[PDB]
């Protein structure tokens, strides 16, 4: 039903999904000269990331992104509640165009963004249930840029895109070290209250966006940008530009878990 572009595109989401028009939405542009340092923000502590179970993980092209199911044995230990892993997925732009990430830092987008989705199992029994509640979800956002060499960790995912080119196709991915999908310096991140960046746009996410970026090769990017289709069959249409436009900060506070010399905040 909903899409990024067209009649049912993002500019029209509010006409079908009211919350998409609300005022504490995601993604946002994080301007470091406006964040507030919070010395009490804990280390994230991803648990079980190195070994996401022993069974093959499902990889699904759902027409809007490619999504990897994750076992609830993985969870984050440094949050207000116990948030267990449910899935991760990606947002990107398109070959020959700039951008592709959802969040921006100091008004600069990167080529793609990885979202690892967790939900509060202390309070709820499923991802879908938690997705509609206040701080029901905790999503980790990793901005992805292009580096000089192939990133093996991301390759564990990218090497399977050709198996799920059509919307709704699925394939299997052997467990791999998920920690390697994360950038360096896990201790430097931003934290704010936001929402799902796709319809229904529920304001249920406690967001964590890392300060440092992960890097994939130029070739891995082109592969991410032009393999999957948004269609179930012919004619085929490439799944591209699946990132939502920036949403107004609307006076929310963005907190930083770190501070350094020359930080634009004190
Ligand atoms: C995302 O949005 C949520 C919802 O708005 C925010 O949650 C609120 O966070 C504030 C923290 O600033 C909470 O208010 C403070 O509560 C302190 C007591 O905390 C305990 O008790 C509360 C209430 O039962 C619990 O929610 C909490 O978990 C603790 O168990 C008070 O000590 C604070 O008062 C002091 O500071 C104020 C300044 O605002 C002074 O005026 C007071 O005199 C005093 O010095 C304050 O009341 C609030 O309870 C939270 N609401 C909910 C529903 O959780 C998140 O902070 C926000 N996250 C981000 C990253 O933006
Ligand atoms: C059930 C569930 O997780 N739905 C989501 N919708 N958008 C998400 S995102 N892009 O904000 O991570 S997660
Ligand atoms: Zn996402």
């Amino acid at each position: 039903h909903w899409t990024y572009e067209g009649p049912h595109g993002q500019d029209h989401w509010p006409a079908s999904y009211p919350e998409c028009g609300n005022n504490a939405q995601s993604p946002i542009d994080i301007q470091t000269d406006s964040v507030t340092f919070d010395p009490d923000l804990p280390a994230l502590q991803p648990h079980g990331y190195d070994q996401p179970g022993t069974e093959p993980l499902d990889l699904h092209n759902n027409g809007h992104t490619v999504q990897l199911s994750l076992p609830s044995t993985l969870y984050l230990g440094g949050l207000p509640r116990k948030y267990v892993a449910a899935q991760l997925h990606l947002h990107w732009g398109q070959k020959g165009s700039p951008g592709g990430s959802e969040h921006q830092i100091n008004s600069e987008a990167t080529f793609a963004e990885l979202h690892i989705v967790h939900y509060d199992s202390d309070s709820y029994d499923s991802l879908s249930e938690a997705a509609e509640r206040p701080q029901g979800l905790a999503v980790l956002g990793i901005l992805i840029e292009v580096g000089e060499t192939k990133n093996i960790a991301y390759e564990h995912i990218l090497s399977h895109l050709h198996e799920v080119r059509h919307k709704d196709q699925k394939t299997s991915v052997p467990p791999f070290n998920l920690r390697e999908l994360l950038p360096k310096q896990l201790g430097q991140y931003f934290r704010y209250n936001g929402s799902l960046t796709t319809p229904p746009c529920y304001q249920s996410v406690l967001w964590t966006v890392f300060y440092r970026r992960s890097q994939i090769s130029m070739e891995q990017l082109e592969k991410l940008q032009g393999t999957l289709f948004s269609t179930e069959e012919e004619p085929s249409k490439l799944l591209v530009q699946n990132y939502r436009a920036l949403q107004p900060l609307n006076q929310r506070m963005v907190f930083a878990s770190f501070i350094q010399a020359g930080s634009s905040y004190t």
Side-chain angles (χ1 to χ4, degrees), residues 68-120:
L68 183 72
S69 295
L70 299 177
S72 60
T73 45
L74 270 48
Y75 66 98
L76 297 170
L79 291 179
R81 318 249 81 283
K82 177 168 179 183
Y83 284 95
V84 305
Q87 51 103 336
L88 57 72
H89 60 269
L90 292 151
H91 298 275
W92 58 89
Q94 69 173 352
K95 186 179 171 175
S97 290
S101 63
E102 301 218 284
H103 290 87
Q104 281 183 30
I105 292 170
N106 290 330
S107 316
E108 301 189 310
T110 58
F111 287 116
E113 186 166 325
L114 167 69
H115 289 159
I116 304 177
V117 182
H118 308 71
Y119 73 89
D120 171 6

Short mmCIF file of all heavy atoms in Angstrom, two decimals, residues 68-120:
data_model
loop_
_atom_site.label_atom_id
_atom_site.label_comp_id
_atom_site.label_asym_id
_atom_site.label_seq_id
_atom_site.Cartn_x
_atom_site.Cartn_y
_atom_site.Cartn_z
N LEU A 68 16.69 -8.78 7.99
CA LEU A 68 17.26 -9.98 8.58
C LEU A 68 16.65 -10.23 9.95
O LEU A 68 16.76 -9.39 10.84
CB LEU A 68 18.78 -9.84 8.70
CG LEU A 68 19.59 -11.04 9.24
CD1 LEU A 68 19.64 -12.17 8.23
CD2 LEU A 68 21.01 -10.58 9.56
N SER A 69 16.00 -11.38 10.11
CA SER A 69 15.42 -11.71 11.40
C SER A 69 16.53 -12.05 12.39
O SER A 69 17.53 -12.68 12.04
CB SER A 69 14.46 -12.90 11.27
OG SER A 69 13.36 -12.53 10.46
N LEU A 70 16.35 -11.62 13.63
CA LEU A 70 17.34 -11.88 14.66
C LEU A 70 16.68 -12.57 15.85
O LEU A 70 15.52 -12.33 16.15
CB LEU A 70 17.98 -10.57 15.13
CG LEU A 70 18.71 -9.78 14.03
CD1 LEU A 70 19.25 -8.44 14.59
CD2 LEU A 70 19.86 -10.65 13.50
N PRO A 71 17.45 -13.42 16.57
CA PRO A 71 16.94 -14.14 17.74
C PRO A 71 16.89 -13.24 18.98
O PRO A 71 17.77 -12.40 19.20
CB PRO A 71 17.93 -15.30 17.88
CG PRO A 71 19.22 -14.70 17.43
CD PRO A 71 18.82 -13.84 16.22
N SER A 72 15.86 -13.44 19.80
CA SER A 72 15.67 -12.63 21.00
C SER A 72 16.69 -12.91 22.09
O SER A 72 16.64 -12.30 23.16
CB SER A 72 14.26 -12.81 21.56
OG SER A 72 14.04 -14.17 21.90
N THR A 73 17.63 -13.82 21.82
CA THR A 73 18.67 -14.10 22.80
C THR A 73 19.66 -12.94 22.81
O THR A 73 20.39 -12.75 23.77
CB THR A 73 19.38 -15.43 22.50
OG1 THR A 73 19.68 -15.51 21.10
CG2 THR A 73 18.46 -16.59 22.88
N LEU A 74 19.69 -12.17 21.72
CA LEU A 74 20.55 -10.99 21.66
C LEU A 74 19.79 -9.83 22.30
O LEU A 74 18.58 -9.72 22.14
CB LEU A 74 20.87 -10.66 20.20
CG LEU A 74 22.12 -11.32 19.62
CD1 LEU A 74 22.13 -12.82 19.94
CD2 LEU A 74 22.16 -11.08 18.11
N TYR A 75 20.49 -8.98 23.03
CA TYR A 75 19.84 -7.84 23.65
C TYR A 75 20.86 -6.78 24.04
O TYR A 75 22.06 -7.03 24.01
CB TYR A 75 19.05 -8.27 24.88
CG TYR A 75 19.89 -8.79 26.01
CD1 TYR A 75 20.25 -7.98 27.08
CD2 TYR A 75 20.34 -10.11 26.02
CE1 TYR A 75 21.03 -8.46 28.13
CE2 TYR A 75 21.12 -10.60 27.06
CZ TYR A 75 21.46 -9.78 28.10
OH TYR A 75 22.24 -10.27 29.11
N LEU A 76 20.37 -5.60 24.39
CA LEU A 76 21.24 -4.49 24.77
C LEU A 76 21.15 -4.32 26.28
O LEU A 76 20.05 -4.23 26.83
CB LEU A 76 20.75 -3.20 24.10
CG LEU A 76 20.79 -3.18 22.56
CD1 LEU A 76 20.06 -1.94 22.04
CD2 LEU A 76 22.25 -3.18 22.10
N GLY A 77 22.30 -4.27 26.94
CA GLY A 77 22.31 -4.13 28.38
C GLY A 77 22.40 -2.73 28.98
O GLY A 77 22.16 -2.57 30.20
N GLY A 78 22.72 -1.72 28.18
CA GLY A 78 22.83 -0.38 28.76
C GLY A 78 21.67 0.59 28.59
O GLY A 78 21.88 1.80 28.54
N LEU A 79 20.44 0.07 28.52
CA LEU A 79 19.26 0.92 28.36
C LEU A 79 18.31 0.88 29.58
O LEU A 79 18.41 0.00 30.42
CB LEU A 79 18.48 0.52 27.11
CG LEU A 79 19.15 0.81 25.76
CD1 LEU A 79 18.24 0.33 24.64
CD2 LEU A 79 19.40 2.30 25.63
N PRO A 80 17.36 1.83 29.65
CA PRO A 80 16.42 1.87 30.78
C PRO A 80 15.67 0.56 31.00
O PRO A 80 15.24 0.29 32.12
CB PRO A 80 15.50 3.03 30.43
CG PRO A 80 16.42 3.95 29.59
CD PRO A 80 17.11 2.94 28.71
N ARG A 81 15.51 -0.25 29.95
CA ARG A 81 14.81 -1.54 30.05
C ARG A 81 15.60 -2.58 29.27
O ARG A 81 16.56 -2.24 28.58
CB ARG A 81 13.41 -1.45 29.42
CG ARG A 81 12.60 -0.17 29.74
CD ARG A 81 11.40 -0.46 30.63
NE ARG A 81 11.78 -0.55 32.04
CZ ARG A 81 12.37 -1.61 32.61
NH1 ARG A 81 12.66 -2.69 31.88
NH2 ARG A 81 12.69 -1.58 33.90
N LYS A 82 15.19 -3.85 29.36
CA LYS A 82 15.86 -4.92 28.61
C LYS A 82 15.27 -4.98 27.19
O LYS A 82 14.13 -5.40 26.98
CB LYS A 82 15.67 -6.28 29.29
CG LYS A 82 16.31 -7.39 28.47
CD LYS A 82 16.42 -8.70 29.22
CE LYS A 82 17.05 -9.75 28.31
NZ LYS A 82 17.15 -11.11 28.90
N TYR A 83 16.06 -4.56 26.22
CA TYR A 83 15.59 -4.54 24.85
C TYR A 83 16.22 -5.70 24.11
O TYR A 83 17.44 -5.78 24.02
CB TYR A 83 15.97 -3.21 24.19
CG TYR A 83 15.10 -2.04 24.63
CD1 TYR A 83 15.51 -1.19 25.66
CD2 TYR A 83 13.88 -1.79 24.02
CE1 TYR A 83 14.71 -0.12 26.08
CE2 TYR A 83 13.07 -0.72 24.42
CZ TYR A 83 13.50 0.11 25.45
OH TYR A 83 12.72 1.15 25.86
N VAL A 84 15.38 -6.59 23.59
CA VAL A 84 15.84 -7.76 22.85
C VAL A 84 15.78 -7.52 21.35
O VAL A 84 14.88 -6.82 20.86
CB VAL A 84 14.99 -9.02 23.19
CG1 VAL A 84 14.99 -9.26 24.71
CG2 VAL A 84 13.57 -8.85 22.67
N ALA A 85 16.72 -8.12 20.64
CA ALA A 85 16.83 -8.00 19.19
C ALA A 85 15.68 -8.70 18.49
O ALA A 85 15.25 -9.77 18.93
CB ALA A 85 18.17 -8.62 18.73
N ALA A 86 15.21 -8.12 17.39
CA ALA A 86 14.14 -8.72 16.61
C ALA A 86 14.53 -8.82 15.14
O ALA A 86 14.26 -9.84 14.49
CB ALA A 86 12.84 -7.91 16.78
N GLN A 87 15.16 -7.77 14.61
CA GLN A 87 15.54 -7.74 13.20
C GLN A 87 16.45 -6.55 12.88
O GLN A 87 16.58 -5.62 13.69
CB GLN A 87 14.27 -7.63 12.33
CG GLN A 87 13.30 -6.48 12.73
CD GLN A 87 13.38 -5.24 11.82
OE1 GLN A 87 14.40 -4.98 11.17
NE2 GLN A 87 12.30 -4.44 11.79
N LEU A 88 17.10 -6.59 11.72
CA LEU A 88 17.89 -5.45 11.26
C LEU A 88 17.50 -5.30 9.78
O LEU A 88 17.01 -6.25 9.17
CB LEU A 88 19.41 -5.66 11.45
CG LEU A 88 20.16 -6.85 10.82
CD1 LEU A 88 20.29 -6.66 9.27
CD2 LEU A 88 21.55 -6.96 11.48
N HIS A 89 17.66 -4.10 9.24
CA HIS A 89 17.31 -3.87 7.85
C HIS A 89 18.08 -2.63 7.40
O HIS A 89 18.73 -1.96 8.24
CB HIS A 89 15.79 -3.68 7.67
CG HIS A 89 15.26 -2.52 8.45
ND1 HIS A 89 14.79 -2.61 9.74
CD2 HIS A 89 15.22 -1.20 8.13
CE1 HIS A 89 14.48 -1.37 10.15
NE2 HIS A 89 14.72 -0.49 9.20
N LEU A 90 17.97 -2.31 6.12
CA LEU A 90 18.76 -1.21 5.55
C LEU A 90 17.99 -0.16 4.76
O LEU A 90 16.90 -0.44 4.25
CB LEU A 90 19.86 -1.81 4.62
CG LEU A 90 20.99 -2.61 5.30
CD1 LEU A 90 21.53 -3.68 4.35
CD2 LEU A 90 22.13 -1.67 5.73
N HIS A 91 18.56 1.04 4.69
CA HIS A 91 17.99 2.14 3.91
C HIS A 91 19.16 2.62 3.02
O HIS A 91 20.31 2.65 3.48
CB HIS A 91 17.50 3.27 4.83
CG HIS A 91 16.41 2.85 5.78
ND1 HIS A 91 15.07 2.85 5.44
CD2 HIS A 91 16.47 2.38 7.05
CE1 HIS A 91 14.37 2.37 6.49
NE2 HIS A 91 15.17 2.07 7.49
N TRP A 92 18.88 2.96 1.77
CA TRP A 92 19.92 3.42 0.85
C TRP A 92 19.30 4.37 -0.19
O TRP A 92 18.08 4.56 -0.20
CB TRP A 92 20.59 2.21 0.16
CG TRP A 92 19.63 1.32 -0.62
CD1 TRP A 92 19.26 1.45 -1.94
CD2 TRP A 92 18.94 0.16 -0.13
NE1 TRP A 92 18.40 0.45 -2.30
CE2 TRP A 92 18.18 -0.36 -1.21
CE3 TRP A 92 18.88 -0.48 1.12
CZ2 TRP A 92 17.38 -1.50 -1.08
CZ3 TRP A 92 18.08 -1.62 1.25
CH2 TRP A 92 17.34 -2.12 0.15
N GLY A 93 20.14 4.96 -1.04
CA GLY A 93 19.65 5.87 -2.05
C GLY A 93 19.65 5.20 -3.41
O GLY A 93 18.90 4.25 -3.66
N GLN A 94 20.50 5.69 -4.31
CA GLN A 94 20.57 5.08 -5.64
C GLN A 94 21.83 5.49 -6.37
O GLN A 94 22.37 6.59 -6.17
CB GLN A 94 19.33 5.44 -6.49
CG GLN A 94 19.25 6.88 -6.89
CD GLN A 94 18.09 7.15 -7.87
OE1 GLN A 94 17.43 6.23 -8.36
NE2 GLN A 94 17.86 8.43 -8.15
N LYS A 95 22.31 4.59 -7.20
CA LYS A 95 23.53 4.82 -7.98
C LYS A 95 23.43 6.15 -8.73
O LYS A 95 22.41 6.43 -9.37
CB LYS A 95 23.71 3.64 -8.95
CG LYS A 95 25.01 3.60 -9.75
CD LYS A 95 25.00 2.33 -10.63
CE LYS A 95 26.15 2.31 -11.63
NZ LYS A 95 26.19 1.00 -12.40
N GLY A 96 24.45 6.99 -8.60
CA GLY A 96 24.46 8.29 -9.27
C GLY A 96 23.82 9.43 -8.52
O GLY A 96 23.81 10.58 -9.00
N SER A 97 23.25 9.14 -7.34
CA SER A 97 22.62 10.18 -6.52
C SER A 97 23.30 10.27 -5.16
O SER A 97 23.90 9.30 -4.69
CB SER A 97 21.13 9.87 -6.31
OG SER A 97 20.39 10.01 -7.50
N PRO A 98 23.23 11.44 -4.52
CA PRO A 98 23.86 11.60 -3.21
C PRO A 98 22.91 11.11 -2.10
O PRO A 98 21.74 10.87 -2.36
CB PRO A 98 24.12 13.10 -3.15
CG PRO A 98 22.93 13.69 -3.88
CD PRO A 98 22.73 12.72 -5.05
N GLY A 99 23.44 10.92 -0.89
CA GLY A 99 22.60 10.47 0.21
C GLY A 99 22.18 9.01 0.20
O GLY A 99 22.69 8.17 -0.56
N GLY A 100 21.22 8.70 1.07
CA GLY A 100 20.73 7.34 1.22
C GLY A 100 20.51 7.02 2.71
O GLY A 100 19.71 6.15 3.03
N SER A 101 21.22 7.69 3.61
CA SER A 101 21.00 7.46 5.05
C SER A 101 19.69 8.17 5.43
O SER A 101 19.18 8.98 4.66
CB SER A 101 22.15 8.02 5.91
OG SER A 101 22.27 9.44 5.80
N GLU A 102 19.17 7.87 6.62
CA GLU A 102 17.95 8.53 7.07
C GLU A 102 18.35 9.69 7.97
O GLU A 102 17.95 10.82 7.73
CB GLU A 102 17.04 7.54 7.83
CG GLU A 102 16.65 6.32 6.95
CD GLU A 102 15.23 5.88 7.19
OE1 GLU A 102 14.97 5.25 8.24
OE2 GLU A 102 14.37 6.19 6.32
N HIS A 103 19.10 9.39 9.01
CA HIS A 103 19.59 10.47 9.88
C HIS A 103 20.74 11.19 9.18
O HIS A 103 21.32 10.70 8.19
CB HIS A 103 20.12 9.90 11.21
CG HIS A 103 19.04 9.37 12.12
ND1 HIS A 103 18.58 8.07 12.04
CD2 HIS A 103 18.30 9.97 13.09
CE1 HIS A 103 17.60 7.89 12.92
NE2 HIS A 103 17.41 9.03 13.57
N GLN A 104 21.03 12.39 9.69
CA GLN A 104 22.16 13.19 9.23
C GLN A 104 22.85 13.70 10.47
O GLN A 104 22.23 13.82 11.54
CB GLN A 104 21.72 14.39 8.38
CG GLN A 104 21.37 14.01 6.96
CD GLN A 104 21.00 15.21 6.11
OE1 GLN A 104 21.50 16.33 6.33
NE2 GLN A 104 20.15 15.00 5.11
N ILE A 105 24.14 13.95 10.37
CA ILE A 105 24.87 14.53 11.48
C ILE A 105 25.48 15.81 10.88
O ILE A 105 26.15 15.77 9.85
CB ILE A 105 25.94 13.56 12.03
CG1 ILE A 105 25.23 12.37 12.69
CG2 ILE A 105 26.81 14.26 13.07
CD1 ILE A 105 26.16 11.24 13.06
N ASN A 106 25.17 16.93 11.51
CA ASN A 106 25.61 18.23 11.03
C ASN A 106 25.25 18.44 9.56
O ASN A 106 26.05 18.93 8.76
CB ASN A 106 27.10 18.41 11.30
CG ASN A 106 27.36 18.56 12.79
OD1 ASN A 106 26.50 19.08 13.51
ND2 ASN A 106 28.52 18.12 13.26
N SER A 107 24.02 18.08 9.24
CA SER A 107 23.46 18.23 7.92
C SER A 107 24.18 17.50 6.79
O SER A 107 24.09 17.92 5.64
CB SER A 107 23.31 19.72 7.57
OG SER A 107 22.77 20.41 8.67
N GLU A 108 24.88 16.41 7.11
CA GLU A 108 25.53 15.60 6.07
C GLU A 108 24.91 14.21 6.12
O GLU A 108 24.90 13.59 7.20
CB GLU A 108 27.04 15.46 6.31
CG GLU A 108 27.79 16.78 6.36
CD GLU A 108 29.31 16.61 6.39
OE1 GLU A 108 29.84 15.81 7.21
OE2 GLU A 108 29.97 17.29 5.57
N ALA A 109 24.39 13.73 4.99
CA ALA A 109 23.84 12.37 4.90
C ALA A 109 25.00 11.48 4.41
O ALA A 109 26.00 11.99 3.93
CB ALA A 109 22.72 12.32 3.85
N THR A 110 24.86 10.17 4.55
CA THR A 110 25.87 9.26 4.00
C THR A 110 25.09 8.43 2.99
O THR A 110 23.91 8.72 2.75
CB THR A 110 26.52 8.33 5.07
OG1 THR A 110 25.51 7.55 5.73
CG2 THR A 110 27.31 9.16 6.09
N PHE A 111 25.73 7.41 2.43
CA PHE A 111 25.05 6.60 1.41
C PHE A 111 24.00 5.58 1.84
O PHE A 111 23.22 5.12 1.02
CB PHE A 111 26.10 5.87 0.58
CG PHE A 111 26.86 6.76 -0.36
CD1 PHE A 111 28.22 6.96 -0.20
CD2 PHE A 111 26.21 7.38 -1.43
CE1 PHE A 111 28.95 7.75 -1.09
CE2 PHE A 111 26.93 8.18 -2.33
CZ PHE A 111 28.30 8.36 -2.17
N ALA A 112 24.03 5.17 3.09
CA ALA A 112 23.08 4.17 3.58
C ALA A 112 23.05 4.19 5.10
O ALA A 112 23.88 4.85 5.73
CB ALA A 112 23.48 2.78 3.08
N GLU A 113 22.09 3.44 5.66
CA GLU A 113 21.97 3.39 7.11
C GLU A 113 21.42 2.03 7.53
O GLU A 113 20.45 1.54 6.96
CB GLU A 113 21.02 4.52 7.59
CG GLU A 113 20.94 4.63 9.14
CD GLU A 113 20.28 5.95 9.60
OE1 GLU A 113 20.47 7.00 8.94
OE2 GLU A 113 19.59 5.92 10.63
N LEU A 114 22.06 1.43 8.53
CA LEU A 114 21.64 0.14 9.07
C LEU A 114 20.84 0.40 10.34
O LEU A 114 21.26 1.22 11.16
CB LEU A 114 22.88 -0.71 9.45
CG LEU A 114 22.60 -1.96 10.32
CD1 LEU A 114 21.85 -2.98 9.49
CD2 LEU A 114 23.92 -2.56 10.85
N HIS A 115 19.70 -0.27 10.46
CA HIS A 115 18.85 -0.18 11.66
C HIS A 115 18.74 -1.58 12.28
O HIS A 115 18.34 -2.54 11.61
CB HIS A 115 17.43 0.34 11.32
CG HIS A 115 17.40 1.80 10.97
ND1 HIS A 115 16.36 2.35 10.25
CD2 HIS A 115 18.32 2.76 11.24
CE1 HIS A 115 16.67 3.63 10.09
NE2 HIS A 115 17.85 3.93 10.68
N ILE A 116 19.14 -1.70 13.54
CA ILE A 116 19.02 -2.97 14.27
C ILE A 116 17.91 -2.68 15.30
O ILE A 116 18.07 -1.86 16.21
CB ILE A 116 20.34 -3.37 15.00
CG1 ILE A 116 21.49 -3.43 13.97
CG2 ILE A 116 20.18 -4.77 15.62
CD1 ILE A 116 22.82 -3.73 14.57
N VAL A 117 16.79 -3.36 15.11
CA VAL A 117 15.59 -3.15 15.91
C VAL A 117 15.42 -4.08 17.10
O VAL A 117 15.48 -5.30 16.95
CB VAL A 117 14.35 -3.28 14.97
CG1 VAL A 117 13.05 -3.01 15.74
CG2 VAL A 117 14.50 -2.29 13.77
N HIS A 118 15.21 -3.49 18.28
CA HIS A 118 15.00 -4.23 19.54
C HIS A 118 13.68 -3.80 20.19
O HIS A 118 13.18 -2.71 19.92
CB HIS A 118 16.11 -3.92 20.55
CG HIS A 118 17.50 -4.08 20.02
ND1 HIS A 118 18.06 -3.22 19.09
CD2 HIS A 118 18.45 -5.01 20.28
CE1 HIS A 118 19.29 -3.61 18.81
NE2 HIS A 118 19.55 -4.70 19.52
N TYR A 119 13.10 -4.63 21.05
CA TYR A 119 11.87 -4.22 21.74
C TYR A 119 11.98 -4.58 23.21
O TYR A 119 12.75 -5.48 23.60
CB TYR A 119 10.61 -4.82 21.09
CG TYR A 119 10.38 -6.30 21.33
CD1 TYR A 119 9.66 -6.73 22.45
CD2 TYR A 119 10.86 -7.25 20.44
CE1 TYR A 119 9.44 -8.09 22.67
CE2 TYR A 119 10.64 -8.62 20.65
CZ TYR A 119 9.93 -9.03 21.77
OH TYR A 119 9.72 -10.36 22.02
N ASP A 120 11.25 -3.83 24.03
CA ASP A 120 11.24 -4.02 25.48
C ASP A 120 10.43 -5.28 25.83
O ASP A 120 9.20 -5.28 25.82
CB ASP A 120 10.64 -2.76 26.13
CG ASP A 120 10.38 -2.90 27.63
OD1 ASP A 120 10.75 -3.94 28.22
OD2 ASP A 120 9.80 -1.96 28.21
#
